């Protein structure tokens with residue numbers, strides 16, 4: 518089929534220590550496999566190019582993927598050029614904290630048509646509250662520097678903003694900052710508490726009541742801009758529009774059930790979702806097994822099967838066709854247990870009662886522009 522992989526080329530290694538981050542190697546309660554060896558990179562690229570049909574996608578995350586260094590990415594591009602025997606279209610993307618981006622990176626990413634996700638939580642004070650370096654110092658100016666480089670070198674990028682309780686209290690400041698910077702492709706990621714911990718216990722924790730307030734305020738700002746002919750693409754609202762018009766969404770977590778994301782750690786180990794890079798969900802190694810073999814594992818089958826359970830409340834919900842129960846990670850409360858109701862169920866219900874009337878209007882407005890914006894959240898065209 519088409520194949521899409523999420524690769525951690527520096528594993529969980531990172532130069533920052535964001536308060537809410539459970540992905541980095543120096544973080545809460547996460548082993549690092551170091552930098553992906555040339556041999557593992559080559560194995561992975563050739564395998565995807567031989568086994569994919571239609572197209573394939575390589576997404577580089579972590580950890581901070583720029584820690585693998587620019588040479589790693591140059592070798593990636595040489596492998597893609599040499600070994601794409603089927604002449605597939607290849608999509609490449611990079612999610613980065615931005616702090617190591619310089620002119621050499623910006624030129625490389627522009628020249629090689631990468632789609633970049635740049636993590637920025639809002640204006641200076643909001644961003645710096647949680648996104649601190651390993652010495653505990655500020656990072657916002659370095660991220661702004663990366664965004665300016667991306668603008669100068671015409672790199673395609675989205676902003677990835679984590680929604681903490683602070684974000685929810687200050688939607689106006691966040692939305693206005695991104696507007697001033699002319700960042701028109703935004704993705705708001707709900708702050709997740711560490712897996713299987715009791716939810717809502719940290720000062721940054723996004724509780725359901727906070728998330729309701731966030732969604733309603735953000736929608737009002739977005740809709741106002743829409744009425745005034747300023748198009749701002751917000752990934753969730755666009756996913757709602759595409760669910761309304763197409764019956765399905767391009768975003769994992771909006772379609773009711775899980776997919777195998779083919780997360781590849783730097784040792785070549787494979788996992789089904791980036792929220793689940795854990796030994797009990799380790800599918801195998803990409804050096805040893807085909808993508809089909811990995812997908813066909815008992816572990817993958819089970820991971821996907823667990824998400825098909827529909828909560829009883831959802832079956833009767835007026836918004837079910839719109840929401841579909843949300844992302845499995847937001848339903849996974851306890852180790853080895855059946856999924857519960859989405860943590861944010863109440864938030865979605867209240868937001869939908871507030872926003873559904875206006876959502877249709879925009880849905881009736883759209884068309885090619887909506888599909889194109891939605892694609893920008895997924896891959897470089």
Ligand SMILES: C[S@@+](CC[C@H](N)C(=O)[O-])C[C@H]1O[C@@H](n2cnc3c(N)ncnc32)[C@H](O)[C@@H]1O
Pocket residue numbers: 531535537538539540578579580581582612613614634635636677678679706707708709710
């Ligand atoms: C894990 S980072 C990896 C790439 C890179 N280091 C960066 O910051 O963009 C990927 C995205 O996940 C987000 N993230 C980190 N901790 C999170 C959490 N607890 N809940 C939701 N997203 C989180 C980050 O802010 C970032 O936007």
Ligand code: SF4
Pocket residue numbers: 531532533534535538539540541579580581614636
């Ligand atoms: S920069 Fe990215 S990986 Fe590193 S600590 Fe922050 S969110 Fe986590």
Ligand code: SF4
Pocket residue numbers: 769770771774775776777778789790791792824843844845846
């Ligand atoms: S947990 Fe969420 S993001 Fe991961 S595969 Fe399932 S729906 Fe997708």
Ligand code: SF4
Pocket residue numbers: 828830831832834835836837840841842843858859861862863865866
């Ligand atoms: S709003 Fe709540 S009950 Fe309705 S589909 Fe979503 S999670 Fe299920």
Ligand SMILES: [Cl-]
Pocket residue numbers: 703704705706751752753754
């Ligand atoms: Cl979003």
